[PDB]
Amino acid sequence: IWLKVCAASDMQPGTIRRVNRVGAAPLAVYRVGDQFYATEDTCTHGIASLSEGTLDGDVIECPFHGGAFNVCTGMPASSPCTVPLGVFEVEVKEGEVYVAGEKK
Amino acid sequence: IWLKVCAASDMQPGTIRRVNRVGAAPLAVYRVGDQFYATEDTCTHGIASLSEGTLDGDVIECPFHGGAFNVCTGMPASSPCTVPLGVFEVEVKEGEVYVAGEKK
Amino acid sequence: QIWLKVCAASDMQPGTIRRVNRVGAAPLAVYRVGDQFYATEDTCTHGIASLSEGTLDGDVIECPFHGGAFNVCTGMPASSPCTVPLGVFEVEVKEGEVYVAGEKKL
Amino acid sequence: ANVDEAILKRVKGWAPYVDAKLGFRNHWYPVMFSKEINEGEPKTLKLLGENLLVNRIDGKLYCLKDRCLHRGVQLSVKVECKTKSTITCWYHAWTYRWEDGVLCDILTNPTSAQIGRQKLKTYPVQEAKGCVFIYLGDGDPPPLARDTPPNFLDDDMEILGKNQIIKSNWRLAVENGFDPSHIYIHKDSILVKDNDLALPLGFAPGGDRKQQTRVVDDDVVGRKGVYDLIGEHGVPVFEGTIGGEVVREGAYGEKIVANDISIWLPGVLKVNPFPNPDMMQFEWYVPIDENTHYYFQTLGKPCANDEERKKYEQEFESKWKPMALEGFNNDDIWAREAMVDFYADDKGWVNEILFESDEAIVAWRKLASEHNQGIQTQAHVSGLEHHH
Amino acid sequence: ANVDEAILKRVKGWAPYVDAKLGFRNHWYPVMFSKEINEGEPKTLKLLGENLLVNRIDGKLYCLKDRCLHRGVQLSVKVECKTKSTITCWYHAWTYRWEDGVLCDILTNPTSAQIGRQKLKTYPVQEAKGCVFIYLGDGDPPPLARDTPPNFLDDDMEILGKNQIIKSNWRLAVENGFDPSHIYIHKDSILVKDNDLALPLGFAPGGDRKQQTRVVDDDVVGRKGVYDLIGEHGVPVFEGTIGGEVVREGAYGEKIVANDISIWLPGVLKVNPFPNPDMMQFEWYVPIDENTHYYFQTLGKPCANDEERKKYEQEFESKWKPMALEGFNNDDIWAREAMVDFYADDKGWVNEILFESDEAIVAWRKLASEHNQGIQTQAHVSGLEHHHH
Amino acid sequence: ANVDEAILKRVKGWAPYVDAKLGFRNHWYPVMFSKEINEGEPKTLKLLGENLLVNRIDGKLYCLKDRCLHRGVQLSVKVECKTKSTITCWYHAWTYRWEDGVLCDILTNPTSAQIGRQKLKTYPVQEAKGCVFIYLGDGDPPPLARDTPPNFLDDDMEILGKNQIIKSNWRLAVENGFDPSHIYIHKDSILVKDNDLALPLGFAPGGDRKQQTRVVDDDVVGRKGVYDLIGEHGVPVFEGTIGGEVVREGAYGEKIVANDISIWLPGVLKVNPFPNPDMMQFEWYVPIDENTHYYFQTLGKPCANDEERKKYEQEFESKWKPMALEGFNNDDIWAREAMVDFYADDKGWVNEILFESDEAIVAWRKLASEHNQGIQTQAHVSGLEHHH
Ligand SMILES: Oc1ccccc1-c1cccc(O)c1O
Ligand SMILES: Oc1ccccc1-c1cccc(O)c1O
Ligand SMILES: Oc1ccccc1-c1cccc(O)c1O
Ligand code: FES
Ligand code: FES
Ligand code: FES
Ligand code: FES
Ligand code: FES
Ligand code: FES
Ligand SMILES: [Fe+2]
Ligand SMILES: [Fe+2]
């Protein structure tokens, strides 16, 4: 199940890392200060990579249309997004970032 | 000739009281600080009750269209109102408000 | 001829404009910017307005017709709709007398 | 949302109604007759400014928004219904289920991640009394009864009607229909002479303001409406005078009609009895866009058997449709159109000078303002907007 | 009121004129000929954006706003004049007197509190020289003469004319009419050959700026206007050159016309003499709405008796109307339309590049800005807007 | 400058392109064929919102803004070319040289100080391959090659074509042209059967995002464009399915066409080979105003002499123009028109739901945003604005 992504220190705060997964959709890992969150990478509104967007606190802004999601709940924060993001639990243990295998 | 309205202490400053007369059109009594004034209740621009309006100093605003009158002179103060109100003489005797049963 | 007597330097306050009418030629405008003097054609290049009837803002004259404007030192447009530079005429003070060139700089 | 805030601030009695230029969301609206849509023949219409498609599949009606999710084209430019249960966009073949709007296939890319992950807006559709109603709203619909006048849905009530597009805002239609003094425009109607109606020129009101109307704030089914009671204590005017000289007379027929007149959200008038003592009229003014409404006219008559229904259908086509729906209501159409300019800049909502019989209209504007289920906005049409 | 503040701030010489897109309130305007309005047959028109009704009662004209006080319908959708002195709205039968606009009756409710307490807008109407003038303004009107050119109202001056609706703003019509150099557009007019006119192509002006015009604000009847004096010191152009080669000649006929040209508030040109040495042209450009005007053409000829009047009328019908009012002024109509686009966004008022003869147009813009009796606004059309302070 | 700033802030990937409603200034655009403009016959056109006059003098093309400096009338309302080298405004006879736009004479006032002191806007014009290109821009033009697709200017490439005005914005035309999945709309074209074409319904993409296209900004002549490489890792779709059942098939003809598709600034598509394996298509979508474009269609075929040029012309008139330019591309016109309403309020640039093949369109949006030579604004049309 759990996917070891990176060293906590591999991500500067307010940055996003794309996690490619063979035979599955990519994930986005968000560093929000000292916390880590994970969603699907693909905006639910289109084909945009949320890892190429803009983190404002715990809200990711899509780079295509300015749609946005809460990276903690996956719920739309800004139009035109309406379909919730899949959220993946993440655990930091011993400075290592792990992301759940499937969404809650 | 004179109608007994209320005890003067019954009206706070900036408040309006509808006076129903049996067999006649309603009146409006306004308390502006310590002075009392009286007009037709019916807005001259339509069929609104000015007693349901908003008093701002000596100016009554009609709830229908935001037309307004000076409650002392009965003269229009805001568009769309163009026709002056009937002013009714008021007299306070022994801390009780009286309205003249015809206009001046 | 070469140098046209305008007025005494002292006959002009800073931030003012004086029209200089000429026989057989188009009028000039002389501008006092602080202690310095500049001269252009008086006719706005955008039309038929007199720049001497405009407003001077530092080194920029504003035309009274349409709000176009020029740098009085360079003659170059400063505000739309002006696009054509003014002719500039050298000014000199000699015995505190203001003199403007009869011919524009090339 | 829809009107200059400076105007909405002035109309404190009824700001939401004045804002409701595109109509009220989260209500049922009639848009066509059952007979106008056949099995597997999709039909286009515009309702509250939204382009819609209605199809009949295994006898049942389905409504999809007529706007592809992908590039915003109308599917209806070139209908491709390639299976019974689906419609395929003509452009890149995005395919949607009629039943739930789900994007179930994309012929141009069967591996697309969009498949199963998007939904085209659907709206509930119900047929009742030969009429097609669309719930132009979000979430589980209320009962149709909520948004229909009393008795329209009675088991024995036989409904026949006519529908057309009229060039006025829906509200000008509602107010004209509920206006007690607008009866003046009908003084020369062929119906009044040829059906021997009593029709005054108007009413001199009696009693107090509160007696001029009866507001219904609820019943069994959550209906919201106003009855016009001007005739309860009012004096019918049969002689019209100028400077005390008689210049016009009302109609002195024997048939008493229009004893109760009520207007209901979302904008449907009931006139009982009309145009004959044994019948009722129910008419909707359905918002199509800011400028246009459906004038959805119905006549109801209790019928116990197929013989009564057949006879009623004959009298409808030979008499009631031409003499009443056309011969009477045609004057309502051009009266509505005559108010367009004064309200078109939204300034008529301030500058109108109301008189006593307008208490009916005022009661409707307040009821509508207080009990509507939502204001349709241009953003509902283009796509709801929110910045976090 | 009517134009972006940033544009008005740029046009310091004539901002009120640029703002006056709907025309000037509190002036008289001609809208039709007397013979077009018959006893008891009300007629509709739009003047300064306002829908009006004119009626003739006992031979006298009356003007009411064609907008019922109640729900804002035009009365004219279905005219009910039920007594000689009144009009009844077709909708709820609100009834108004032609004489004072007073709401005197309501057939749908004869007990209404509104009766006697409301009044529909009226405008003064006056007939002169078989033309119908409406004072589109407030309070007791000035004398008509204030808003007419000199001689128009002369006892002996016989007035004949034509009126029609033109798709330009009124100001484009005024400026074109008063434009000294626009004569170029008339160089092939049938009037030029067929009435043997002298007509230059244009003017080389002479003298100073002040000598190019006579600004009249000292007229005893209060008329305000400008004379075009370009030809007092100017050399008329009869040979137009490109590269010094003659490419065009003016017309070398014997008849001298357009000696004195003057523009008068609220927007009426006087051309004298024209289109013949013994006649005058008076034409108005009357604002209907921001996009349209009446082109109200008149020709004056002094006449002494019915014989001269009938012969004048015959030549008007057979020659002056077809050959001058149409054959000459038709080119003015499409010249006006050609300026619409540049001025339609109000940016033409900034971007125009004027030359010397436009001094006449500038003098008019300043006169109009300083002496107009009011700026018509959209709020005049819908209903005046004011909040207590 | 052209679009609500709140919408532009949302489209961070391609704001300049969304702002470019009037098109891109400082590029070459084709506007007519050489054969359509004869000696001393001036022709009017609107390009990027500007009214232009084109004239041919001693066989050379000259372009002047069709707007007199004086009172802003179109010279073209009544053309007066009095000398070979000049045009005289019909109004007050301001006279301009075709060659440099200098106000060289005024017939109405030969003493005017304006004479020699004003200049009407001119634009560079050049004819290549029987096509008239105008450089709608300021200063010394770049080489034409920069704003043409590869091989359009080849020595032997014979160019024939057709031009018309289409009622959509130019960008809808460009995106439709370069859209890999829009091939679906062509599945019933008379060209597909009558020229024996292989034509899939669409593509299942393969490989990563960067592999879907080739962005060209290394071309030595400075041309800027994108190749559609969907077919390099993609599986073409020949069997279109709904619920796994085949409802439509592609075309299994022998002739292989559209091996390479590229879009180039300022908005020209190259399809090779098309509509036959020995031919190429180059088509421009030239901005006229916010709402309309020239659809400037050309077919190129290598021809070695007059005989081949002549047989190509005869084939063009009898086959390629009716079967391909009309029979194939007519569907493109109504596809473009179908997207107008969604994009007309500028909201479609936010609300569109893209899928995988739209990678090509996004690559073009970003290219166009980064490498365009300027944004045409309404102030370029009315007269540029600047306060000191
Ligand atoms: O509302 C009414 C009152 C009296 C008589 C007829 C009517 C009437 C009937 C049907 C439709 C309408 O618009 C009416 O005014
Ligand atoms: O103004 C003019 C100057 C010279 C010749 C004719 C006219 C003229 C004549 C009639 C009506 C007009 O508007 C004119 O400008
Ligand atoms: O781009 C294409 C892909 C497959 C088949 C045809 C075309 C095509 C051919 C001519 C003009 C166009 O705009 C096309 O998209
Ligand atoms: S693709 Fe993310 S907001 Fe549209
Ligand atoms: S009814 Fe009072 S302002 Fe209109
Ligand atoms: S004349 Fe000076 S700005 Fe136009
Ligand atoms: S617009 Fe409908 S599938 Fe593309
Ligand atoms: S609108 Fe005229 S009487 Fe009601
Ligand atoms: S508008 Fe062209 S010369 Fe005056
Ligand atoms: Fe009615
Ligand atoms: Fe003229």
Ligand SMILES: [Fe+2]
């Ligand atoms: Fe295509």
